């Protein structure tokens, strides 16, 4: 409901939708997300598939399950770009998953959940880092 928030939801939603469907600051972040995020998905494919299964076994809602898991990642009080990029990446992996089970309409809310957790709970952190400009330079 602000400019960090809508700019975050722009990047995340876009990345998740283009991953599922196979194909200034925001656009640079998206480029970085494609480079790094596609990497994470290749290299942690076995782990991601294991986690997806686990989520599905406990069928409590894919985007809600994602939300609980995502909150737990940050419970130790540490925040960093690795954590943020790994979660968006796992989000993309789950978004591809939702598309393969003819549940594309759940991708938009997935994207919102991730953004909510990010901007709502890590705002202070995101500001000190110069938002998505920090992200781009961290992985540059």
């Amino acid at each position: 409901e602000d400019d960090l928030y809508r700019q975050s939801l722009e990047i995340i939603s876009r990345y998740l939708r283009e991953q599922a469907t196979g194909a200034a600051t925001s656009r640079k972040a998206l480029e970085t997300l494609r480079r790094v995020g596609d990497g994470v998905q290749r290299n942690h494919e076995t782990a991601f598939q294991g986690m997806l299964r686990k989520l599905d076994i406990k069928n409590e809602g894919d985007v809600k399950s994602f939300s609980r898991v995502m909150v737990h990642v940050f419970k130790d009080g540490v925040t960093n770009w690795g954590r943020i990029v790994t979660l968006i990446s796992f989000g993309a992996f789950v978004a591809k998953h939702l598309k393969s089970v003819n549940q594309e309409s759940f991708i938009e809310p997935l994207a919102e959940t991730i953004t909510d957790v990010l901007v709502r709970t890590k705002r202070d952190w995101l500001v000190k880092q110069r938002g998505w400009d920090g992200f781009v330079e961290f992985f540059h």
């Binding site: 994470v40 942690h44 782990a47 986690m51 686990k54 989520l55 406990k58 399950s65 609980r68 898991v69 995502m70 909150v71 737990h72 990642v73 419970k75 130790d76 540490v78 960093n80 770009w81 690795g82 954590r83 990029v85 790994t86 979660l87 796992f90």
Partner: peptide, 19 residues
């Protein structure tokens, strides 16, 4: 709960490596 803790820590460790 334990399955969400396990998955969360699992993502945390790989994330901290990438970082």
């Amino acid at each position: 709960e334990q399955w969400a803790r396990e998955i969360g820590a699992q993502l945390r460790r790989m994330a901290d490596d990438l970082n």
